[PDB]
Design a protein around this ligand. Structure first.
Ligand SMILES: C/C(=N\NC(=N)N)c1ccc2[nH]c(C(=O)Nc3ccc4cc[nH]c4c3)cc2c1
Ligand SMILES: C/C(=N\NC(=N)N)c1ccc2[nH]c(C(=O)Nc3ccc4cc[nH]c4c3)cc2c1
Lengths: 280, 280
């Protein structure tokens, strides 16, 4: 059965997609989504402190036989369902969604959080309309940046310190780049309807495809996509994490300098919000 | 002032060497050492669970204005004081002490603990006699091995996973090798009376000396040391952490196949212990 404290506040309903259930908050008679994780504490603390229009908000939490995370309901479901079975979005729709993913992840990295599991299943859409807000979810693998062991190590004289630790200094502090790579793979899929690295009709192992950076490029699928969109993908799918585009660099890329797209996003934000009166 | 709960149980005395104070446990009238760390929880939990004759034991803990760690008193003081100012130990004494450091660190790695700050200041001697027991201390930088993020990452399909993470797999799980490198540096110092890497009369930076593995070799100091002892040092001061000797490999090295040394250690252990009667 559902835990009593959850029942006290919510009426549970149908499965939306771990499971995600529709529920109704009794107080408001409004819909919520309830993520059930079978037996997270850090994920909750992260979700509670973040405040961005493209990051899912937590409404409630119950730690019982299973975990119950109560969230705002995103009516449009998961991005995965828009791109599965070779389905692909209009380039303009890709740009609107990708811009928002970039804003969200930029906000995470500014706030010292790396997501580490960005994928279409973790991108939620606000409605069944093509032009909609998106929100990232699932901080179950996310890492909080703070002062490292390495930093403390480097404060003393390395008389006794192993060479591999001094070697690691060249690359330390780029862990956030893994999110930019996943973004690149998401963008590749949204624009083309097929993954850049996979075992479908190829002899090269998945690992080798990825570490070499040699994505599967099929000209015929890509001919209808703009040069600028592909140029961004290429800058994100860079094997060297120090050379890989950051979210700031991606947000400055020509493909994203799109006044009409940005207007649409601003309009959608305005429509979402229920603000109080304000002075002047 | 000292915290009341500490005063209740102990009478505090002179400074031995953060500070380390001599104190007397009131209950037994016996000497203890009290490490004061100015404002650790993990260090205490580690110290409480470890049980090896060459690892310092915790007797008590007080979390007050400062931390107070009550330990067994090692009358011989720190190894640092035996090797400072170019002083150097007889090779036989080096071997007896190094054997015990190896046993201690082998026990740590078997138990999923990496020390990460091995140095002469953290090696304590049981008496002012040359032939004595040694115990490692200071787990303030120590790391507890468990299931990694990497392990969980590798359980799924790396469709979205960044190449640097797959690259890291080749070297993961050798973090314990940093202790073997520090051991090598300790052994180098004990045998020679001088550090292998330093800025004394040289143009090469300390970092470069270390990452290249090019220790300062002075033939005249080393002529009186055995070939076998230096051979062990060389196998520990190996730049590649996957090729570097482990504690098991070091314990199997010819230099440590010394029946007389091992007999001395066994005799010293026997002398330390106050056991109860036993059956048969
Ligand atoms: C917070 C979280 N996971 N956390 C962990 N796994 N630790 C998570 C992951 C995936 C999620 N998906 C959703 C979500 O609302 N999904 C969803 C699925 C189908 C439909 C259909 C209409 N709206 C839907 C929403 C919430 C959600 C939360
Ligand atoms: C547990 C610990 N440090 N932990 C942390 N810094 N977090 C630590 C470090 C160094 C230490 N040194 C000693 C110790 O007993 N030192 C010492 C110093 C001088 C003399 C002279 C006679 N006996 C001595 C013992 C205890 C001890 C504990």
């Amino acid at each position: 059965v559902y835990p009593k404290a959850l029942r006290d506040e919510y009426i549970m309903s149908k499965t939306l997609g771990g499971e995600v259930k529709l529920a109704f908050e009794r107080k408001t008679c409004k819909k919520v989504a309830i993520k059930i994780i079978s037996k997270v504490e850090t994920e909750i603390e992260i979700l509670k402190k973040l405040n961005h229009p493209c990051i899912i908000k937590i409404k409630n939490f119950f730690d019982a036989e299973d975990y119950y995370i109560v969230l705002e309901l995103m009516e449009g479901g998961e991005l995965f369902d828009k791109v599965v079975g070779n389905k692909r979005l209009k380039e303009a729709t890709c740009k609107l969604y990708f811009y928002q993913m970039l804003l969200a992840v930029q906000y995470l990295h500014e706030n010292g959080i790396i997501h580490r599991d960005l994928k279409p299943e973790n991108v939620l859409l606000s409605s069944q309309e093509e032009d909609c807000l998106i929100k990232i979810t699932d901080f179950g693998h996310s890492k909080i940046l703070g002062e490292t062991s390495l930093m403390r190590t480097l404060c003393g004289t390395p008389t006794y310190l192993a060479p591999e630790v001094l070697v690691s200094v060249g690359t330390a502090g780029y862990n956030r780049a893994v999110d930019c790579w996943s973004l690149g793979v998401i963008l590749f899929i949204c624009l083309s309807g097929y993954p850049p690295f996979s075992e479908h009709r190829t002899q090269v192992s998945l690992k080798d495809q990825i570490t070499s950076g040699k994505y599967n490029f099929i000209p015929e699928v890509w001919a209808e996509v703009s040069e600028k969109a592909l140029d961004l993908v290429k800058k994100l799918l860079v094997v060297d994490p120090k050379a890989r585009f950051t979210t700031e660099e991606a947000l400055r890329h020509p493909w994203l300098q799109d006044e009409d797209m940005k207007r649409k996003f601003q309009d959608l934000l305005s429509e979402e919000n229920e603000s109080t009166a304000l002075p002047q």
